[PDB]
A = this chain, B = another copy of it.
Amino acid sequence: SGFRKMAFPSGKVEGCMVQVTCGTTTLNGLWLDDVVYCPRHVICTSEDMLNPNYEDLLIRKSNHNFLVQAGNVQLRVIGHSMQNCVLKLKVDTANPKTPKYKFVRIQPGQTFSVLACYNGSPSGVYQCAMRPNFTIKGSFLNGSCGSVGFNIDYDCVSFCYMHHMELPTGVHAGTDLEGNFYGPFVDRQTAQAAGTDTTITVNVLAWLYAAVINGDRWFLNRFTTTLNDFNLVAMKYNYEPLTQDHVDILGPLSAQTGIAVLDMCASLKELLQNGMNGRTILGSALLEDEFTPFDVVRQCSGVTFQ
């Protein structure tokens, strides 16, 4: 038992991180087979970064303008192209550590692991959720651009995020690995800002089930509620609506604990209306919404990855 913010083992991704330099800018790239993926804003100067025409900027670049460092070994760049907001740098060596992989795009409310990197060197791993407003609450400093987010399905790495920028509130924005931004953000210096967020209701319910599995039961009650009446309370507290599909997804956790989904909804309603009155749930005095039902089953049942 116990319940932790748990990331996937990062080894398979560590073997893919490289350093990409163009001009005076250094950031991280992802080396898979003979291609290195990195944010296209690597080619921008400080004054380019204001209002850039990336097609113009890239046509003025040459293969030799891109220095790629794979540990302490040069990679020779033999081609370059732009795909949406990422650059694809063709190199003359296929990464011998290429894992099996997929490029997937995730949904708000889904989670993933982030391998924070600097100068092509991994520094730490942590778990994030894609917020409903398409930002992530990451931990990123200067030089972290090009770090990637991913999930692992058994032996296959599903890359879902590459880091591009920090918004003024300290949250983070980036793209999928096809270079398409999550949310209404652009790789150019505007006054862009996150905009309103909501709490991920189905995840809060999953985490309440995790708590019951780990012996926290004080918030339970004999009460129940209807889905419609629950959603009336959810909207009032900036929670997003609970669908019948969410209820179905919570089925296994409901069966394991013997607590019907709509009963756990009744418990959530009371927590929203009354607060916690000095008590905690799984070491938190807040309702936690960055664990999916899958994350809870993974950790309160025990699947590995090879």
Contact = CB atoms under 8 A, between A and B. Distances in A.
A141 interface: yes
A214 to B, nearest CB: 6
B122 A7 contact: no
Interface in A25-53: none
A204 to B, nearest CB: 14
B138 A2 contact: yes
B9 A137 contact: no
A5 interface: yes
Interface string A289-303: 000000000111111
A11 B8 contact: no
A258 interface: no
Contacts of A115: 9
Interface stretch (A179-187, A223-231, A278-286): A278-286
A124 B8 contact: yes
Contacts of A285: 284-286
A4 B6 CA distance: 12
A96 interface: no
- Dominant SS at the A interface? loop
A139 B302 CA distance: 10
A124 B299 contact: yes
Contact of A302 (B123, B126, B286, B306): B123
Contacts of A121: 304-306
> Which of A124, A127, A302: most chain B CB closer than 10 A?
A124
A14 interface: yes
A294 B215 CA distance: 33
A132 interface: no
A247 interface: no
A171 interface: yes
Contacts of A215: 170
B2 A139 contact: yes
A128 B6 CA distance: 11
Contacts of A126: 4-7
6 contacts: A1-B141, A3-B139, A6-B116, A6-B125, A7-B125, A125-B125
Interface of A: 1-12, 14-15, 71, 115-119, 121-128, 137-143, 166, 170-172, 214-215, 280, 283-286, 298-306
Given A2-B137, A2-B139, A9-B122, 5 more contacts: A9-B10, A9-B125, A141-B300, A170-B215, A284-B284
